[PDB]
Design a protein around this ligand. Structure first.
Ligand SMILES: *Cc1cc2c(cc1C)nc1c(=O)[nH]c(=O)nc-1n2C[C@H](O)[C@H](O)[C@H](O)COP(=O)(O)OP(=O)(O)OC[C@H]1O[C@@H](n2cnc3c(N)ncnc32)[C@H](O)[C@@H]1O
Ligand SMILES: *Cc1cc2c(cc1C)nc1c(=O)[nH]c(=O)nc-1n2C[C@H](O)[C@H](O)[C@H](O)COP(=O)(O)OP(=O)(O)OC[C@H]1O[C@@H](n2cnc3c(N)ncnc32)[C@H](O)[C@@H]1O
Ligand SMILES: *Cc1cc2c(cc1C)nc1c(=O)[nH]c(=O)nc-1n2C[C@H](O)[C@H](O)[C@H](O)COP(=O)(O)OP(=O)(O)OC[C@H]1O[C@@H](n2cnc3c(N)ncnc32)[C@H](O)[C@@H]1O
Ligand SMILES: C/C=C/c1ccc(O)c(OC)c1
Ligand SMILES: C/C=C/c1ccc(O)c(OC)c1
Ligand SMILES: C/C=C/c1ccc(O)c(OC)c1
Lengths: 555, 555, 555
């Protein structure tokens, strides 16, 4: 329609109208939804994600938000749209599925921007190669989707996924965000090979070997470039020749993604998932010094998770169902909890991979290792209650999608998530030292600390899990406050966040300040060169086209 | 001095003189060598690499070549020099050690360019972190150098390298080139985390977490930025936050490198190196279908090498010492050879890693697998002649540097190497099919095919090893001819070269043509944005600043 | 000469030489000193200030530093020089006298810059108007100089100065820096009216009424503009008409100053100086709540000083002469000290002004007020030891210059000063709260806190007096560390530094960050508009011309 609630910059309304008109004129009235009124107030459900904004909203609901939604039906649409977005300096905000909750979701950093709902149309599994062990997909291929495909093609016996805690995210969006999963193939971004992208100027690109063109043949003649098959090695060798640019494409506004090759993990013929429970909060420390060499030793296989009891607990029940108390729960209450549960204070989930002769020693290796930790306790799914999270993580650690996790998003009544994700070494000390802070602050903020550590190889992803009730302002402000505070400390102590929410992108990019913002500066430089017009989602990762004021924009 | 043999573009001589004057005025007369005359004709030795040009020269000796050599004494020097190089539009050609033989060596794509001999001064091991398992180095830290360091620090017991066939290359240059080595840590570029670079405009940058600044402290105050320590995670987590740009830094002219974090491989406590010999030339095919799933299965550990007999043979002796014949040796002569040697036609080198319970099954696994191949034969170093290459590769597969390889560079009298390095799937067929061609052509070119395959995980690096006598023109022309021919075919069949010589950069970047050179186009765009002046080694990877004509420049 | 140790940016050496040649060619070989070698290592004495760099150097000695010194002989010289500085993009660094010690002294933020020693030639008292009560001076009129003038003109009986703790600073440099003195006329910058400045483009300007041109007359015809007399009101009314721009001229690189009108304080016919001593460290708190309304009440007249015992003590003796101990002195040692001295822990100096009937009540007013503070004790100079600082401050509070202060610069052996100068409310609490921090940190830094508070009217200038031994690196680093730390806290708690050293300009301008650096941004904007070339002392107050990289430049 005619009158969206928010116009992007300097966009006049007739201009908005024309744009929106040429646009419906391409993609179909079907492919567009304007956002005419607050009857938008509608945040949604994981099952049916809203695109207009951030559901897990810490800011005012309407704070970051669409002017309109646009669902390109195919690459050329994106191309056309960019052209228009280019004609009018309308800005973009592409997304794949929108489950980017706890970071912003569908919500665009710049309000009045257009939402490029890619995945809606662009749902395809382009290919799944067994010999190469990989798949090629679109923004719309959600994981489950990816799964059922192999399923309805009996592939699971030949091949395997690597999911994140939840099943519905875009395999593609996730890889660009540098999302992480739990099988040894957990480092998603790194498992990519050959992607295609519509650059800021509308022109297509195929990274790496995506560039060595498939040789011609009758069969393939006359297909649009976005339609031509790929060279042999495209998807089996990420680097190509010359600059390795693919990275400009992750957590950046360099281009709009349309496709990507993700490598698949070949069924291993042997899979043992387990859980060593850690008794003392201080366990976390020895626990890590422990995992340290096993991870570097490869005795540890996939990316193992070290959980804080409440994550498990909260998956099991809301906060209220364990304490009808407003404040943070006492440290003694967790201990009751660990127990009511059989859990640890801390809880380490991992999985074994391979022929049994293989797993056996590994496991003799770990089990024997975790032994120095008193009250340590080991376990197979089997050995556990039928709602036990070890139950969920077994599927999880084998590429099977689930949706049991969100339940935890439920601790609080208008539970919403917000993730503080500082990186931390794999040193019990550092792990401890970082934890202290974050906690300390969750207390002051009046919160239940809840969070884990994704067991990186020489690093570790510290996911602080801040929930809070989205309908409680006193609180929302505390989170914001907590947010930016934790951001400073961590940094103050030397730790950066690896990915973050729309609302803190700036703050954190600011952490990245060596030599006077040089990194940021460099980015801008390339951003402008390539996106002179600032059309393609400006402000992401805290980077802005000249055209955007820092002052008018930052946060 | 005054009069170099070749001036870079539009550089007038007084201009050359001033530049060279302000320059000696910084780095010391010591740090500079002008190239006043053909008394330069001097190609050198691996032990003492020439910087002025390409030793393994296929082109006229003087074809690609310095105007002068400059050895920055420290980062600021590089900075200063860039500034001047910037003042005057003088162009750069940075290198670390120069052993880039078989690709160009020290030689600059653009003649009259200045040679930035980094490594000469910039020799330091900045750090070697055990807990993190990694080292931080300069352009000048050659591998051996890297080795002896750990050695003279008793580290080998805690940590391990990953060398390439030769010991003296720059750990750093090698990683940027995306060089590859043989331990499981063989994928060099990928083992990097945190690098620093002097951009085209003189400003410093530190990629990734290199950017999250180490927090302040008395101890560290007042040190130049190039001198400040790194944040904690800098070197344990390559991605940082926002765009993952590091890749603009590999096989590109985006910036000048000054430092880099390479992760180290923790001693594994168990190491078995071996060799299964392949009897028939056609073995190569089944051989691969074989390795295919073991590599994807991780039964295969490091990057294993599949050798062509002559590589081994030639390491053992020149060509003449096996046939006093000019032409390519008959296929029957190889067979005599395989035998005179105990070798296969093809020969697969690999290594086992870990506690023995660990290796045993693996090995039972491989050995049992290679079994379907008749006359197959397995072996430990022990089981072999004391000059046997299995002898050399054991050290090799454990990070120990050697220099036994070059000997092979000796097949021919004024042996020089030239590498054709097309990628190829891990399919016996493809492997075969690619081999056929390359060979076929080596024949026509009047050459001994010689080459291997670095066992990639879902790919394979096909290194065609073209030697030829550098002092034989009829021949040099045949190689050039062979070169560009093989380049077309491979491509014609769908295979790209992953890295190449100075003289073929263009040709190959041209292979990368999907959608009308889009990849190349994109590159230029960012290259100019960042290196408006085209000062920093123009033409690399076949990319050129506006300022350089395609026509005047390409090849 | 030929070869200065440091060239400014992109300046080539022949260029440096030409510049320096045309330049000697104007001002005389006499007016120039190149800085050819480290035989420069020479830091000097207050009596004979070095221009080349920072004497009180926290950084490496040579860290900030001249390329050459230039002493303009008259306004046109400055004009000429700018022109050249303009021709060549050579940068400027103007100074009046150089006693800007504890902030940088003569030292230029950008090394290789030229030092514009104004005051050397430009020594004149242009006028001293009795009727108007004001003087007009040049950069070279040091205070004492200003004094002796009135003296040798019997003026003191008619008029009075307002000095800062030391006598030799430039009356003019001091006013631009917003330096402060102790008579009621202590707010220096504010006592200005009509200034002249050579803008960045060489053109002259006269602020305010300086602009309403003196009407013509035979007597004045044909004099250069820099030579013409001023309009009547020029110097009696700072605002003029239209924009009140004078302020772009204080603690900014907007223009080069050549002259300025400072109003004079008419002898008051009655002057009583005194000192109430404060016993407890905690006294400082009640003490302030006390002064608060008297200052706002004008019962308090000039700007009174609240001293920390050690300042007085240190004026009396080095540190060693009270404790042969390296560490910070105990809090009990001060108490011995207060006593050995008759001093307070804290010590409040002020002065009475006017006809006696006038002073009497005031004093009855204060004395009676300070009474609630136990052990409080009052005093006239008379009532005190002949080296007593009350002795020095009496002259001080009456415009009489002295040089007794520096002695304190002597606490430490290679005593050097560094000033942390955060503003603080006039609330005992705030005063306390700010003090705590600063101290706390001086301890950790391993230092004697030493400092005061200039009794502002609704504010207070908290001068932390950091000394340290310039020849002790472990220490220098601690100060730097302390420096930037205190800067963050203060800010963290809401307090900004009002003026600072060369080395922290950036850091602090960064404190000034509301709305995303808007203030800084605005500044740059006007800076460039007016100093397109960045010639006029770039980086001051942390502001930089486009031409200067933040990254290359900041700190
Ligand atoms: C609530 C929650 C979230 C969560 C999690 C557990 C819970 C309970 N566990 C996660 C985990 O283990 N690992 C992980 O990486 N994330 C996890 N999250 C966060 C989130 O749910 C997932 O990461 C999810 O996969 C992210 O959302 P989705 O995959 O739906 O992606 P999106 O909203 O479409 O956005 C991706 C962002 O990247 C850029 N983008 C996306 N598509 C494109 C295209 N086509 N072109 C260019 N850029 C694209 C956009 O910036 C978009 O915002
Ligand atoms: C003759 C030969 C070569 C060879 C080999 C076996 C033989 C007998 N085996 C190799 C192997 O197993 N793996 C491999 O990657 N290479 C192998 N080669 C080739 C070569 O010897 C090595 O790769 C060698 O490490 C490369 O040379 P070196 O390491 O000395 O590097 P360089 O000449 O200095 O150049 C590196 C290139 O990259 C860019 N570069 C280098 N330093 C910088 C800095 N500081 N900043 C920016 N760019 C830099 C330049 O383009 C330079 O040309
Ligand atoms: C060591 C010390 C310092 C001190 C003090 C007590 C001691 C023991 N007490 C001070 C006090 O009570 N009040 C005060 O304001 N400062 C005090 N200080 C610091 C210092 O000694 C004095 O402030 C002194 O007056 C400053 O130095 P000086 O007056 O010699 O000025 P300068 O070095 O030439 O520099 C002035 C700065 O401002 C700009 N400037 C100067 N002249 C010009 C011209 N002509 N045009 C444009 N800008 C100019 C420059 O940036 C220069 O750096
Ligand atoms: C917990 C869920 C989660 C959220 C954000 C992430 O980045 C992540 O992977 C490391 C996991
Ligand atoms: C044989 C030596 C060699 C040459 C070039 C390479 O790139 C390489 O690694 C794959 C190995
Ligand atoms: C003590 C000396 C001093 C130093 C710097 C100043 O700015 C000042 O005046 C407020 C006084």
């Amino acid at each position: 329609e005619f009158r969206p609630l928010t116009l992007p910059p300097k966009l006049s309304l007739s201009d908005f109208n024309e744009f929106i008109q040429d646009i419906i004129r391409i993609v179909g009235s079907e492919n567009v939804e304007v956002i005419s009124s607050k009857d938008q107030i509608v945040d949604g459900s994981y099952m049916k994600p809203t695109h207009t904004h951030d559901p897990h909203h810490v800011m005012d609901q309407d704070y970051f938000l669409a002017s309109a939604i646009v669902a390109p039906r195919n690459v050329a649409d994106v191309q056309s749209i960019v052209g228009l977005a280019n004609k009018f300096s309308f800005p973009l905000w592409p997304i794949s599925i929108g489950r980017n909750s706890g970071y912003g979701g569908a919500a665009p950093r710049v309000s009045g921007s257009v939402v490029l709902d890619m995945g809606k149309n662009m749902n395809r599994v382009l290919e799944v190669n067994v010999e190469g062990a990989y798949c090629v997909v679109e923004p719309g291929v959600t994981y489950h989707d990816l799964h059922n495909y192999l399923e309805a093609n009996n592939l699971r016996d030949k091949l395997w996924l690597d999911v994140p805690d939840l099943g519905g995210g875009s395999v593609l969006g996730n890889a660009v965000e540098r999302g992480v999963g739990y099988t040894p193939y957990g480092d998603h971004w790194m498992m990519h090979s050959g992607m295609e992208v519509v650059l800021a100027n509308g022109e297509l690109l195929r990274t790496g070997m995506g560039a060595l063109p498939d040789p011609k043949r009758p069969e393939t003649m006359g297909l649009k470039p976005e339609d031509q098959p790929w060279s042999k090695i495209a998807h089996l060798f990420p680097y190509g020749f010359g600059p390795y640019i693919d990275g400009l494409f992750s957590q950046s506004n360099m281009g709009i993604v349309t496709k990507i090759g993700i490598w698949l993990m070949p069924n291993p013929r042997g899979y043992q998932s387990y859980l060593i429970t850690l008794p003392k909060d201080g366990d976390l420390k020895q626990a890590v010094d422990i995992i340290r060499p096993l991870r570097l030793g490869m005795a540890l296989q996939n990316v193992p998770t070290i959980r804080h009891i409440l994550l498990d607990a909260a998956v099991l029940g809301d906060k209220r169902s364990y304490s009808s108390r407003t404040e943070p729960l006492s440290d003694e209450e967790l201990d009751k909890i660990a127990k009511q549960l059989n859990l640890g204070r801390w809880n380490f989930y991992g999985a074994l991979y391979g022929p049994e002769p293989i797993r056996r020693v590994l496991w003799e290796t770990i089990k024997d290792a975790f032994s120095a930790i008193p009250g340590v306790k080991f376990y197979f799914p089997e050995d556990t209650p039928e709602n036990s999270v070890l139950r969920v993580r077994d599927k999880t650690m084998q590429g099977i999608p689930t949706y049991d996790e969100l339940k935890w998003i439920d601790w609080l009544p208008n539970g919403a998530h917000l993730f503080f994700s500082p990186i931390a070494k794999v040193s019990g000390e550092d792990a401890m030292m970082q934890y202290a802070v974050t906690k300390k602050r969750c207390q002051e903020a009046g919160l239940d600390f809840i969070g884990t550590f994704t067991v990186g190889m020489r690093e570790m992803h510290h996911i602080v899990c801040i929930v809070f009730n989205k309908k409680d302002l006193i609180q929302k402000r505390k989170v914001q406050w907590l947010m930016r505070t934790l951001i400073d400390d961590c940094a103050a102590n030397g730790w950066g966040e690896y990915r973050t929410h729309l609302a803190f992108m700036d703050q954190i990019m600011e952490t990245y300040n060596w030599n006077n913002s040089s990194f940021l500066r460099f980015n801008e430089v390339l951003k402008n060169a390539v996106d002179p017009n600032g059309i393609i989602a400006p402000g992401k990762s805290g980077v802005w086209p000249s055209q955007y004021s820092h002052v008018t924009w930052k946060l």
